[PDB]
Amino acid sequence: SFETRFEKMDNLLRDPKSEVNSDCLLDGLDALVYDLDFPALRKNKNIDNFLSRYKDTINKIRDLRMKAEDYEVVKVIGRGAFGEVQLVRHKSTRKVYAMKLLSKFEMIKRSDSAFFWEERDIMAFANSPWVVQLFYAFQDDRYLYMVMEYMPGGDLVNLMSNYDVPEKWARFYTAEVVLALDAIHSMGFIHRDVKPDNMLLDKSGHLKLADFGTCMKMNKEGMVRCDTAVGTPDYISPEVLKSQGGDGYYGRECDWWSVGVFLYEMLVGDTPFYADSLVGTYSKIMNHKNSLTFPDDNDISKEAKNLICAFLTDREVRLGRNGVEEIKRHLFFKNDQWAWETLRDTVAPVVPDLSSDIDTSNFDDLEEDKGEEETFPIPKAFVGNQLPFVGFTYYSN
Amino acid sequence: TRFEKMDNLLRDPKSEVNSDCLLDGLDALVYDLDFPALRKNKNIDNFLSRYKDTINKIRDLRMKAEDYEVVKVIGRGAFGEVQLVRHKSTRKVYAMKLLSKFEMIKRSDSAFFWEERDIMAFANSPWVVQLFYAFQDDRYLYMVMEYMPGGDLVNLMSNYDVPEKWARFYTAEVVLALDAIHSMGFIHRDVKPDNMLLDKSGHLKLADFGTCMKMNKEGMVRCDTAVGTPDYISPEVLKSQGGDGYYGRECDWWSVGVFLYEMLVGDTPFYADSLVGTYSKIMNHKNSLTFPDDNDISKEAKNLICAFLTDREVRLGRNGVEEIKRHLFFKNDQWAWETLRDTVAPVVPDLSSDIDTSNFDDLEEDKGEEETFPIPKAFVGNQLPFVGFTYYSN
Ligand SMILES: COc1cccc([C@@H](C)NC(=O)Nc2nc(-c3ccncc3)cs2)c1
Ligand SMILES: COc1cccc([C@@H](C)NC(=O)Nc2nc(-c3ccncc3)cs2)c1
């Protein structure tokens, strides 16, 4: 077991999970230069001499390290209002990735400076077939960049658009979602916003989760709360809605609610709590006992109905509170086509036909930004606008 | 393109982006941000709380002062002290120079240790004391050097009457050592007995390079300030105060001259009871230089001394080290210039333990309160000149 203090420090430098690993240490030096280098501050001798020594070296480094210009944008596949996701090709390696941008200016402006750490940890270290991998995370003074495996199948929102979905497809996406969720729960995170938008497909037609921006680390009892605004409460559980009003905390069972909702939308074509307005949808969720109706549209399966209803109940009696297993054993999941262990080796309901490695078919065209980039007021003293982003850099090796 | 090369940039002990400089960066940053006034900036407060745990940990993992037992305090330079220290685990004994960050700020003069670090680390010479590790905390820089139980020429000079035979030896060694330094591109200035140390076998090493400077093309330097030890300072360097001039490596040779005088005469040539007096006699050396009336001293001894204590442009060594080596004062049957360090030193120190302090004067401790920095209301970047100082030998 024993290691010397020198050995231990060496491990800190080399460990991708360490915040003092070499790449993170360059980040600091970089940021510090960014934030110090200004005529006003250069009047300080310590600062002026320091920037003279290191700057020539800092230019070598900024030249050497990965950068936005190592990639060319093929297209824009999504917009998050903190930035865009865009299809890219690496110039030297020819390889094709999806790339998320985050505006540093926007983040300082609105706060929301701390929120991307969990997404980073998850996509970097999950090492799951159920989770989109981040290959590189790097940055400059303007932006964060997350370079991710591209998922040409598109999301489940697109799928529900182009296909009516039989219980046989539903069961399958549902099961994969169960697994990705469980994977994420086992790393100690609660996803907390689980939607068809966050479910994408690889060239095989298999599902991965993306967009972990809402994810929070659970503690001991496996609970959390965050202050975070949520676009639509369509898939959001009642106890999460209550929590936003200060009331209290909650556990991973909130994610199983979303899945209950996801199923209903796949079979029935509609969100169960759908209303013309946010307020209406909101009331309906809080009303869920009396507000949840199975369709005009059909009789659909006794078993499907029962799973959906088991997920869409109140949290204390809700399916999945006793763990993933009682979910897996639900009779809704019985079939001849796949078993839980073999699921990803099955052939998928929809296997994308793709013209090229650049095929955008399953995504909507994203027109343009072409907006003029906002800049900060020149510091009269040190404001450290780069500090929140220090240690973000990651290279998978 | 394959690329990285940052592997080498990170691994090069001479690289400024190497791992230890990178860690010095983060360490300096935290020290300099941690303050009530500065934590009112949220950017800062948030960064400090994020990296605090990991920073406390690094500080402990990396080499620190607590890793050493202080045995005796063997010197004080008013920029700090020099201690004989023993590593608490390895049990190895080392010399450690403490440089105060507070003082190198107050007096400015924050840049001088770089060349000293550079030399002691990478010289790889039997003529130059070797730097093993360098580290720092908020208060100090720490240089850890090979220990030199032989002591310095001043101690030797007080305990003995140096015969010409010995002076030939020590001068010759100083000469070879200086040459090596010159060949690395530096002018020492500051050549005085106090910086000449004897190893366990009694051979000579140069230390305290804090005053060194790097030559250019013609091998000169441009300096308008005069550098230390009034007794040993050359006319050029004295005169260079007040904007004057720019000069080469023969100011060191001048000090070798003073050194030789001191050993054989037992006094300094420019001694007076004020430095003011000494500066003056130095300017007037052409007159003020005299040997004692009694004297029994070889003519060629006095000649060599006189060849050094002349003006720079006629100064022995101005042509090359060779004209010094060929001087008749060095003529003898015992040793040759290339083998000289393999010969048997005139004094081989007798030592009790590896810890033996007998050849160093008695010094004690500060006993004073640490005079420390005022809390900033804004980023002063006070640690920034020290980033990249840390060194580990392997
Ligand atoms: C708040 O900041 C944001 C910046 C950009 C985008 C977003 C939104 C749309 N959510 C998201 O992560 N969507 C993502 N889609 C992928 C993706 C898509 C296709 N192929 C590979 C990856 C990653 S994240 C938010
Ligand atoms: C520049 O500011 C100063 C700060 C503290 C001390 C000094 C003096 C004592 N000179 C010096 O470096 N002396 C040296 N002694 C050694 C040494 C001693 C014993 N064994 C090996 C080396 C190196 S430098 C100056």
CSV table of C-alpha atoms in Angstrom, one decimal, chain A residues 45-262:
chain,number,residue,atom,x,y,z
A,45,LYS,CA,6.3,45.5,-11.6
A,46,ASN,CA,5.7,41.9,-10.3
A,47,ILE,CA,3.1,41.6,-13.0
A,48,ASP,CA,5.1,43.2,-15.8
A,49,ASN,CA,8.2,41.2,-15.2
A,50,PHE,CA,6.3,38.0,-14.8
A,51,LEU,CA,4.4,38.5,-18.1
A,52,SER,CA,7.6,39.4,-19.9
A,53,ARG,CA,9.3,36.1,-18.9
A,54,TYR,CA,6.3,33.8,-19.5
A,55,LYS,CA,4.6,35.4,-22.5
A,56,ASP,CA,6.9,34.2,-25.3
A,57,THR,CA,6.5,30.7,-23.8
A,58,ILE,CA,2.8,31.1,-23.4
A,59,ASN,CA,2.5,31.7,-27.1
A,60,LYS,CA,4.4,28.5,-27.9
A,61,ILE,CA,2.0,26.7,-25.6
A,62,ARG,CA,-1.2,28.3,-26.9
A,63,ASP,CA,0.1,27.4,-30.3
A,64,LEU,CA,0.9,23.7,-29.4
A,65,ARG,CA,-2.2,22.8,-27.3
A,66,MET,CA,-5.5,21.8,-28.9
A,67,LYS,CA,-7.6,24.7,-30.1
A,68,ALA,CA,-10.8,25.6,-32.0
A,69,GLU,CA,-8.7,26.1,-35.1
A,70,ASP,CA,-7.6,22.4,-35.0
A,71,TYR,CA,-11.2,21.7,-36.1
A,72,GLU,CA,-13.4,23.1,-38.9
A,73,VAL,CA,-17.1,23.4,-38.4
A,74,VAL,CA,-19.1,21.2,-40.8
A,75,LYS,CA,-22.5,22.3,-39.6
A,76,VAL,CA,-24.5,23.5,-36.6
A,77,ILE,CA,-26.6,20.7,-35.1
A,78,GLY,CA,-28.0,22.5,-32.0
A,79,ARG,CA,-28.4,25.6,-29.9
A,80,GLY,CA,-28.3,26.0,-26.1
A,81,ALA,CA,-28.3,29.8,-25.6
A,82,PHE,CA,-25.0,29.4,-23.8
A,83,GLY,CA,-23.6,28.2,-27.1
A,84,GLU,CA,-24.0,25.7,-29.9
A,85,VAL,CA,-23.3,22.1,-30.6
A,86,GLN,CA,-21.7,21.8,-34.0
A,87,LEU,CA,-20.5,18.9,-36.2
A,88,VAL,CA,-16.7,19.1,-36.7
A,89,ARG,CA,-13.8,17.4,-38.4
A,90,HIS,CA,-10.3,17.3,-37.0
A,91,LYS,CA,-7.9,18.7,-39.7
A,92,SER,CA,-4.9,16.5,-39.0
A,93,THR,CA,-6.7,13.3,-38.1
A,94,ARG,CA,-9.7,13.7,-40.4
A,95,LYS,CA,-11.9,12.3,-37.5
A,96,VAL,CA,-15.4,13.5,-37.0
A,97,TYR,CA,-16.8,14.7,-33.6
A,98,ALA,CA,-19.7,16.7,-32.1
A,99,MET,CA,-18.6,19.8,-30.3
A,100,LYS,CA,-20.3,21.8,-27.6
A,101,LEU,CA,-19.5,25.5,-27.1
A,102,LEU,CA,-19.9,27.4,-23.9
A,103,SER,CA,-19.6,31.2,-23.8
A,104,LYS,CA,-17.4,32.4,-21.0
A,105,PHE,CA,-18.8,35.9,-21.4
A,106,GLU,CA,-22.3,34.7,-21.1
A,107,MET,CA,-21.6,32.7,-18.0
A,108,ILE,CA,-19.9,35.5,-16.1
A,109,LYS,CA,-22.9,37.8,-17.1
A,110,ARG,CA,-25.7,35.5,-16.0
A,111,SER,CA,-23.7,33.7,-13.3
A,112,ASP,CA,-24.1,30.0,-14.1
A,113,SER,CA,-20.3,29.7,-13.9
A,114,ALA,CA,-20.2,26.3,-12.0
A,115,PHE,CA,-22.7,24.2,-13.8
A,116,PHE,CA,-20.6,22.2,-16.4
A,117,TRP,CA,-18.4,20.3,-14.0
A,118,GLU,CA,-20.7,17.3,-13.7
A,119,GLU,CA,-21.3,17.1,-17.4
A,120,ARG,CA,-17.5,17.1,-17.7
A,121,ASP,CA,-16.9,14.4,-15.1
A,122,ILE,CA,-19.7,12.2,-16.5
A,123,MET,CA,-18.8,12.3,-20.2
A,124,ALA,CA,-15.2,11.9,-19.4
A,125,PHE,CA,-15.2,9.1,-16.9
A,126,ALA,CA,-18.5,7.2,-17.2
A,127,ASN,CA,-17.0,4.7,-19.7
A,128,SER,CA,-20.4,3.4,-20.6
A,129,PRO,CA,-22.0,2.3,-23.8
A,130,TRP,CA,-25.0,4.1,-22.4
A,131,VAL,CA,-23.3,7.5,-22.2
A,132,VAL,CA,-21.8,9.9,-24.8
A,133,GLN,CA,-18.1,10.1,-24.3
A,134,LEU,CA,-16.1,13.4,-24.2
A,135,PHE,CA,-12.7,12.9,-25.9
A,136,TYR,CA,-11.3,16.4,-25.4
A,137,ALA,CA,-12.2,19.5,-23.3
A,138,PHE,CA,-10.2,22.6,-23.9
A,139,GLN,CA,-10.7,26.3,-23.9
A,140,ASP,CA,-9.6,29.8,-24.8
A,141,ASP,CA,-10.4,33.2,-23.4
A,142,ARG,CA,-13.8,33.2,-25.2
A,143,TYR,CA,-15.2,29.7,-25.0
A,144,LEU,CA,-15.2,26.2,-23.5
A,145,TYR,CA,-15.1,23.4,-26.0
A,146,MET,CA,-16.3,19.8,-25.3
A,147,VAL,CA,-15.4,17.4,-28.1
A,148,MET,CA,-17.8,14.4,-28.1
A,149,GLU,CA,-18.5,11.3,-30.0
A,150,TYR,CA,-20.9,12.3,-32.8
A,151,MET,CA,-24.3,10.5,-32.7
A,152,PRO,CA,-25.8,10.6,-36.2
A,153,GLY,CA,-29.0,8.7,-35.3
A,154,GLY,CA,-30.4,11.9,-33.8
A,155,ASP,CA,-32.6,12.2,-30.7
A,156,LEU,CA,-35.8,10.4,-29.7
A,157,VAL,CA,-37.8,13.6,-30.4
A,158,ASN,CA,-37.0,13.2,-34.0
A,159,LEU,CA,-37.9,9.5,-33.9
A,160,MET,CA,-41.3,10.1,-32.5
A,161,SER,CA,-41.8,12.6,-35.3
A,162,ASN,CA,-41.0,10.2,-38.2
A,163,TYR,CA,-42.5,7.0,-36.8
A,164,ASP,CA,-45.6,5.8,-35.0
A,165,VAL,CA,-44.1,3.6,-32.2
A,166,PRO,CA,-45.3,0.1,-31.4
A,167,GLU,CA,-45.0,-1.4,-27.9
A,168,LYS,CA,-42.1,-3.4,-29.3
A,169,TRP,CA,-40.0,-0.3,-30.1
A,170,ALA,CA,-41.1,1.5,-26.9
A,171,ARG,CA,-40.1,-1.5,-24.7
A,172,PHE,CA,-36.6,-1.4,-26.3
A,173,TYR,CA,-35.8,2.4,-26.0
A,174,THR,CA,-37.4,2.3,-22.5
A,175,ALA,CA,-35.1,-0.6,-21.4
A,176,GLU,CA,-32.0,1.1,-22.8
A,177,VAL,CA,-33.0,4.3,-20.9
A,178,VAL,CA,-33.4,2.3,-17.7
A,179,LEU,CA,-29.8,1.1,-18.2
A,180,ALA,CA,-28.2,4.4,-19.0
A,181,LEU,CA,-30.1,6.0,-16.1
A,182,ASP,CA,-28.9,3.2,-13.8
A,183,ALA,CA,-25.3,3.6,-15.1
A,184,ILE,CA,-25.5,7.3,-14.1
A,185,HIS,CA,-27.1,6.5,-10.7
A,186,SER,CA,-24.2,4.2,-10.0
A,187,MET,CA,-21.7,7.0,-10.5
A,188,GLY,CA,-23.6,8.8,-7.8
A,189,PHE,CA,-25.4,11.4,-10.0
A,190,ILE,CA,-29.1,12.2,-10.3
A,191,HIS,CA,-29.9,13.2,-13.9
A,192,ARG,CA,-32.9,15.2,-12.9
A,193,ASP,CA,-33.9,16.3,-16.4
A,194,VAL,CA,-34.6,13.2,-18.5
A,195,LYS,CA,-36.1,13.8,-21.9
A,196,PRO,CA,-36.2,12.4,-25.5
A,197,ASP,CA,-33.9,15.3,-26.4
A,198,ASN,CA,-31.2,13.9,-24.0
A,199,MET,CA,-31.5,10.5,-25.7
A,200,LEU,CA,-29.5,10.1,-28.9
A,201,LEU,CA,-28.7,7.2,-31.3
A,202,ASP,CA,-25.3,5.9,-32.6
A,203,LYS,CA,-24.9,4.6,-36.2
A,204,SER,CA,-26.3,1.3,-34.8
A,205,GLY,CA,-29.6,2.8,-33.7
A,206,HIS,CA,-28.6,2.4,-30.1
A,207,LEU,CA,-29.4,4.9,-27.4
A,208,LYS,CA,-26.9,7.0,-25.3
A,209,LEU,CA,-27.7,9.9,-22.9
A,210,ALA,CA,-26.2,13.3,-23.6
A,211,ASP,CA,-26.7,16.8,-22.0
A,212,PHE,CA,-25.8,16.1,-18.3
A,213,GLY,CA,-25.9,19.9,-17.5
A,214,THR,CA,-28.6,19.3,-14.9
A,215,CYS,CA,-26.8,16.4,-13.1
A,216,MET,CA,-26.1,16.7,-9.4
A,217,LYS,CA,-24.0,14.4,-7.2
A,218,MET,CA,-26.1,12.6,-4.6
A,219,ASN,CA,-24.8,12.4,-1.0
A,220,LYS,CA,-25.3,9.6,1.5
A,221,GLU,CA,-29.0,9.1,1.6
A,222,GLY,CA,-28.8,9.6,-2.1
A,223,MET,CA,-30.5,13.0,-2.3
A,224,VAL,CA,-30.0,16.4,-3.7
A,225,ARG,CA,-31.4,19.9,-4.4
A,226,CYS,CA,-30.4,22.6,-6.9
A,227,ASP,CA,-31.7,26.1,-7.6
A,228,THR,CA,-31.9,25.4,-11.3
A,229,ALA,CA,-34.5,26.7,-13.7
A,230,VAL,CA,-36.1,23.9,-15.8
A,231,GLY,CA,-37.3,24.3,-19.4
A,232,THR,CA,-40.8,22.9,-19.4
A,233,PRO,CA,-42.0,20.7,-16.5
A,234,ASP,CA,-43.2,18.1,-18.9
A,235,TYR,CA,-41.0,15.2,-17.7
A,236,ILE,CA,-40.3,16.7,-14.3
A,237,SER,CA,-41.7,14.9,-11.1
A,238,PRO,CA,-44.1,16.5,-8.6
A,239,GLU,CA,-41.6,16.4,-5.7
A,240,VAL,CA,-39.0,18.2,-7.9
A,241,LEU,CA,-41.5,21.0,-8.6
A,242,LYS,CA,-42.3,21.3,-4.9
A,243,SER,CA,-38.6,21.4,-4.1
A,244,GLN,CA,-38.0,24.4,-6.2
A,245,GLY,CA,-40.3,26.3,-3.8
A,246,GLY,CA,-37.8,25.7,-1.0
A,247,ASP,CA,-39.8,22.8,0.5
A,248,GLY,CA,-37.0,20.2,0.5
A,249,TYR,CA,-34.9,17.5,-1.1
A,250,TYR,CA,-35.3,14.3,-3.1
A,251,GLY,CA,-33.7,11.2,-4.5
A,252,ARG,CA,-33.1,9.4,-7.8
A,253,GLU,CA,-36.7,8.2,-8.0
A,254,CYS,CA,-37.4,11.5,-9.6
A,255,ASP,CA,-35.6,10.2,-12.8
A,256,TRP,CA,-37.9,7.1,-12.9
A,257,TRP,CA,-40.9,9.5,-13.1
A,258,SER,CA,-39.4,11.0,-16.3
A,259,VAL,CA,-39.2,7.4,-17.7
A,260,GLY,CA,-42.8,6.8,-16.7
A,261,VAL,CA,-43.6,10.0,-18.8
A,262,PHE,CA,-41.3,9.0,-21.7
